[PDB]
A paper describes a structure:
Here, we report the crystal structure of T. maritima reverse gyrase containing this minimal latch at 2.9 Å resolution. To gain insight into the structural basis for this differential effect on activity, we determined the crystal structure of rgyr_minlatch. Although rgyr_minlatch crystallized in a different space group, the overall structure is similar to the structure of the full-length enzyme, revealing a padlock shape. Equally small r.m.s.d. values are observed for the individual helicase domains (0.94–0.98 Å) and topoisomerase domains (0.52–0.67 Å), demonstrating that deletion of the globular domain of the T. maritima reverse gyrase latch has no significant effect on the reverse gyrase structure outside the latch. The minimal latch formed by residues 387-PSMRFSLEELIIPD-400 emanates from the H2 sub­domain and retains its short β-sheet, i.e. the first and last four residues of the sequence. In contrast to β-turns, which have a length of four residues, the loops in β-bulges consist of five or six residues, distinguished as type 1 and type 2, respectively. Typical of type 2 β-bulge loops, the minimal latch in rgyr_minlatch forms a hydrogen bond between the NH group of residue i (Phe391) and the carbonyl group of residue i + 5. The twist is a result of Phe391, the first residue in the β-bulge loop, rotating its side chain into a void that is normally occupied by Phe401. Deletion of the globular domain entails the removal of Phe401, apparently prompting Phe391 to fill the void and maintain van der Waals interactions with the methylene groups of Glu850 in the T3 region of the topoisomerase domain. Apart from Ile398 in the β-sheet, the location of which is the same in all T. maritima structures, Phe391 is the only residue that makes any interaction with the topoisomerase domain.
Author numbering: 2 to 1041
The structure:
């Protein structure tokens, strides 16, 4: 622990508790002074301080009682899915059962109703078919005790049985009612006035047919009509409804959704019960993609003699399908078609009378999408790449989405085992194949291998082994995993490759649920930081106890209207008085309640110092609720990044946390003290936000004097059939004589890949953009899974990055110029590089075509520079011929070096290498003399300041862009026509006051030394408390 305090972290009183006790899982000193109690609940009870821990105590008791009852009557323990479902039942929550198909769904809801019946609560079970009503009734009465009241309603009942159901209904003398969806459709008003405690529906599509059916269920769980009218008016208006907290609804559970609720009516569940009817887009796929370079039927015949059984063939058009169906019928293949007798032929394929089925590639074709039997469909073959027609031209592009659907029919989660499938493409067109490969890489991150690198025997052995493992009864391994990030955009990228099935609205945040082979995966976004230092108390929010400093933190509040952020516990914004506050206290409370339901929790913030501090704040808060907390750092937001991050799962690195604390303290103490001294002088407030800001302003102010001092003389000479020459001073002669000419060969190496500083400088200069916007574009590209982590100080490139470079060069047929370079061996992160072998031109094509739609042209250009920078670093050295020409101008000898030829290509393909006209050993005439003055020391630009900051050891990748932009926001600097930064009159006299009284606390030497100290703290090489002592004495000198 880092010995800090948080203002709402106590799990029992909701008040202030220290860092250490939360880590140990204990309440604050006020609630329970004992460090090591036998039981926290009993100790709180004895001291008569038991306020909120009673809820968790009853929650675990209720869940354990539920699970105990399940094992007693079912005989088995709760699976991972049913473990999460049970933890929500005892909490009174309503949800959608997000899981693969199986008998575990109906059995759980049947067991849940029995458990509620044992508590005296009444339940209702709805089934699509009257047959399912009878079977579940049979399962109930076999297991239910004789005391339990179970009644049913279907069409073929006894006359006495129908009357005994109704009579038990009107007298309210029942515990479980088991009727079909037809009963709900025909008895809306009869159920509309009764309030049940649990409703289980097996088919959601029977209810989606009528909006009245949705309202009937909401009436059944105890929602007033006055609430429905306001909610329906809000959603039809396009907004989100807020519930009355005093409402006590029932429990609604949905089993499986075919996910076709086009109407707005299902969205009423999201606003009225905080759960989403799931559009189960399952991304759990394991498919090998192989391309065969021709459409030779002989190879197809040979391939089918290997695959033998369970084969689908997709033709582009019906005529091609008819030809293939006839061709394989003349040959002795058991084949069937789908375009005429779809129903009969597919059933023959299911049972085994047909080995091969032929269809047509439609985006939502019945064979392409409307079939689901992976246990039989093992191999999918495409007789041509599926394609679409894009815009009004005849331009033909691959239909990647149709390919993903058709190939996906061979792989899904079946009986808890994710089966393996094979997709084979017969494509003669190389360019169409290349277009599909990158499209599949962007969406599915799945490669396509060539024919010569595929072992058919091993692949089919893998296919049959996986299915034979799925068909036998499996031992459950499912776990419920929680993923916590801080950025909403990162969560959206996660939902694209994990697959958003359902979504829950938990107080201030939204939690999405997805199906994976390991079980259920939950993920949510924090929307920024959770804690920050309090403004008042002690030394500007830092207390002192036992000679050590304790930082005090409180939850962040962000006003949604004006955006002002503050830490004080206030109902309204202190600047604009609005009450539309993004309150992180509710975010923390939501995470604590989620931590109860999940088996495992992983914090996945950014992999830097700022992200690590956020991770510890969340983990220490969530520790009193669950002990299953760990940390993962993702360097790319992709499937590969998530897998690699989980493989390096670890605990919280406290050295990173302490580095953040000392960095924030330095800005707080130095800034507040300088702001106060500047407050009295120049009137305004918050004029200084750290030591680094003052130092950089000093560079800009003093640059004006030395820029003017450095004015030397130059003369522009344009020579006939030659380049322009800049010579010093006034040149009188009109003839330039070449006296020496040497021509040489060299191998020019490329520039290293981008770091945060180098990317900020080069991109800002070339795109005429400020360094703050470039940083934001870098952040978006990383958060959307296009580049590696953008806050980096290293040029290190891993073998995987080199592997990406080789893959692209192999694609473009220029594999020969590949040259793997690891660059630096030092560095926490890699350099800024693309994560997939896609260049900006292909990205722009898929943006113009709409495969992706949230990248602006500024994002494209920034990505283009990064991609070219990285591949230049991975390309072979360029061979060039140059010349060293010595010329005499006015008796002055001047040597010029210029590249004249490019003998061998290399990284010059990605970064252009300028050549110059060849020089001869003769005299040259001057056409024009452009006389002008240029200063030896040029002024500052935004790119140059960042470049100057790193070379001087000032600033960090997390601060470079921030430091520059703060000067503009304070009005200390401006930009002229040529985008040079220039100090304002206010900025000069602000720096003038500091440089004349407080140079010791502002000077560059102090800034660099403190930065190196804090970097040593980050590595754990210097003491955390000692560093704070040094900061205290420095500010205490000027405090008076
Ligand atoms: Cl065969
Ligand atoms: Zn307490
Ligand atoms: Zn053969
Ligand atoms: Zn406000």
């Amino acid at each position: 622990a880092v010995n800090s305090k948080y203002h709402h972290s106590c799990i029992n009183c909701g008040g202030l508790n220290t860092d250490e006790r939360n880590e140990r899982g204990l309440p604050c000193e006020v609630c329970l002074p004992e460090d090591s109690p036998s039981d926290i609940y009993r100790a709180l009870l004895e001291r008569k301080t038991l306020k909120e821990y009673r809820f968790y105590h009853e929650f675990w008791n209720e869940y354990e009682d539920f699970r105990s009852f399940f094992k007693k009557k079912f005989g088995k323990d709760l699976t991972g899915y049913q473990r999460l479902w049970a933890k929500r039942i005892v909490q009174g929550k309503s949800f959608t059962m997000v899981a693969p198909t199986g008998v575990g769904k109906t059995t759980f809801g049947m067991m849940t109703a029995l458990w509620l019946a044992r508590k005296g609560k009444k339940s209702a079970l709805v089934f699509p078919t009257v047959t399912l009503v009878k079977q579940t009734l049979e399962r109930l009465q076999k297991l239910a005790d004789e005391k339990v009241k179970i009644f049913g309603f279907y069409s073929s009942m006894k006359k006495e049985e129908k009357e005994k159901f109704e009579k038990s209904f009107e007298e309210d003398d029942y515990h479980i009612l088991v009727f079909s969806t037809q009963f709900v459709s025909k008895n809306r008003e009869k159920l509309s006035q009764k309030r049940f405690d649990f409703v289980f529906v097996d088919d959601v599509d029977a209810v989606l047919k009528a909006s009245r059916n949705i309202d009937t269920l909401l009436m059944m769980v105890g929602i007033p009509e006055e609430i429905i009218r306001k909610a329906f008016s809000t959603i039809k208006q396009g907004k989100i409804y807020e519930r009355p907290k005093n409402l006590k609804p029932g429990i609604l559970v949905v089993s499986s959704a075919t996910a076709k609720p086009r109407g707005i009516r299902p969205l009423l569940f999201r606003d009225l019960l905080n759960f989403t009817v799931g559009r189960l887009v399952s991304v759990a796929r394991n498919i090998t993609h192989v391309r065969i370079s021709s459409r030779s039927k002989e190879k197809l015949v040979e391939l089918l003699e290997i695959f033998r059984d369970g084969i689908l063939i997709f033709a582009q058009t019906e005529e091609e399908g008819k030809e293939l169906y006839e061709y394989l019928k003349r040959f002795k293949f058991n084949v069937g078609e789908t375009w005429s007798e779809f129903e009969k032929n597919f059933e023959d394929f299911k049972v085994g009378k047909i080995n091969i089925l032929i269809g047509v590639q439609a985006y939502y074709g019945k064979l392409t999408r409307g079939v689901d039997l992976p246990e039989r469909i093992k191999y999918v073959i495409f007789w041509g790449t599926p394609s679409m027609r894009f815009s009004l031209e005849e331009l033909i592009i691959p239909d990647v989405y149709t390919y993903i659907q058709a190939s996906g029919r061979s792989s899904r989660i079946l009986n808890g085992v994710l089966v393996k499938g094979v997709s084979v493409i017969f494509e003669e067109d190389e360019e169409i194949f290349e277009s599909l490969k990158t499209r599949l890489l962007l969406i599915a991150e799945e490669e396509i291998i060539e024919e010569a690198e595929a072992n058919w025997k091993e692949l089919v052995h893998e296919v049959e082994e996986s299915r034979r493992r799925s068909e036998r009864e499996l031992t459950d391994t499912s776990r419920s995993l929680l993923i916590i990030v801080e950025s909403p955009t990162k969560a959206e990228t996660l939902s694209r490759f994990l697959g958003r099935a359902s979504s829950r609205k938990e107080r201030n945040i939204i939690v999405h649920e997805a199906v994976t082979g390991e079980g259920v995966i939950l993920f949510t976004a924090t929307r920024g930081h959770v804690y920050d230092l309090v403004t008042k108390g002690g030394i500007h929010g830092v207390e002192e106890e036992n000679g050590k400093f304790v930082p005090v933190y409180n939850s962040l509040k962000r006003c949604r209207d004006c955006g002002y952020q503050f830490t004080e516990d206030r109902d309204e914004c202190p600047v604009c008085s609005s009450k539309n506050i993004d309150d992180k206290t509710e975010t923390l409370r939501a995470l604590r309640e989620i931590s109860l339901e999940a088996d495992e929790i992983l914090v996945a913030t950014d992999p830097d110092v700022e992200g690590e501090k956020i991770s510890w704040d969340v983990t220490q808060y969530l520790l009193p609720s669950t002990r299953s907390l760990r940390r993962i750092e993702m360097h790319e937001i992709t499937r590969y990044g998530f897998k690699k991050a989980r493989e390096s799962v670890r605990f919280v690195d406290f050295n990173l946390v302490k580095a953040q604390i000392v960095r924030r303290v330095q800005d707080r103490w130095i800034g507040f003290e300088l702001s106060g001294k500047l407050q009295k002088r120049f009137g305004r407030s918050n004029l200084s936000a750290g030591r680094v800001q003052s130092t950089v302003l000093g560079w800009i102010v003093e640059r004006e004097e030395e820029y003017k001092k450095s004015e030397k003389d130059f003369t522009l000479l344009v020579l006939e059939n030659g380049v322009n020459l800049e010579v010093e001073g006034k040149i009188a002669d009109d003839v330039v004589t070449v006296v020496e000419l040497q021509e040489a060969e060299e191998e020019k190496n490329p520039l290293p890949p981008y770091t945060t500083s180098s990317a900020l400088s080069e991109i800002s200069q070339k795109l005429r953009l400020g360094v703050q916007e470039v940083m934001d574009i870098l952040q978006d590209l990383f958060e959307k899974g296009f580049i590696t982590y953008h806050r980096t100080d290293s040029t290190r490139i891993s073998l995987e990055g080199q592997n990406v470079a080789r893959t692209y060069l192999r694609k473009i047929g220029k594999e020969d110029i590949f040259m793997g370079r690891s660059w630096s061996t030092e560095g926490a992160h890699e350099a800024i590089r693309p994560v997939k072998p896609i260049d900006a031109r292909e990205l722009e094509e898929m943006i113009e075509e709409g495969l992706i739609a949230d990248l602006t042209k500024k994002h494209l250009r920034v990505y283009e520079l990064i991609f070219n920078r990285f591949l230049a670093s991975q390309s072979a050295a360029v061979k060039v011929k140059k010349q060293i020409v010595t010329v005499d101008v006015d008796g002055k000898r001047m040597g010029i070096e210029q590249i004249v030829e490019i003998l061998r290509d290399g990284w010059n393909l990605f970064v252009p290498l300028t050549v110059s006209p060849r020089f001869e050993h003769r005299t040259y005439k001057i056409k024009e003399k452009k006389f002008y003055k240029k200063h030896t020391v040029p002024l500052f630009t935004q790119a140059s300041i960042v470049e100057e900051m790193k070379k001087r050891g000032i600033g960090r990748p997390s601060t470079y862009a921030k430091i520059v932009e703060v000067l503009f926001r304070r009005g200390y600097v401006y930009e002229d026509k040529y985008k040079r930064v220039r100090p304002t009159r206010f900025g000069v006299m602000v720096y003038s006051y500091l440089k004349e009284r407080y140079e010791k606390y502002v000077t560059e030497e102090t800034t660099r030394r403190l930065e190196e100290i804090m970097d040593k703290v980050e590595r754990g090489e210097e003491d955390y408390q000692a560093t704070l002592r040094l900061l205290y004495e420095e500010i205490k000198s000027l405090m008076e």
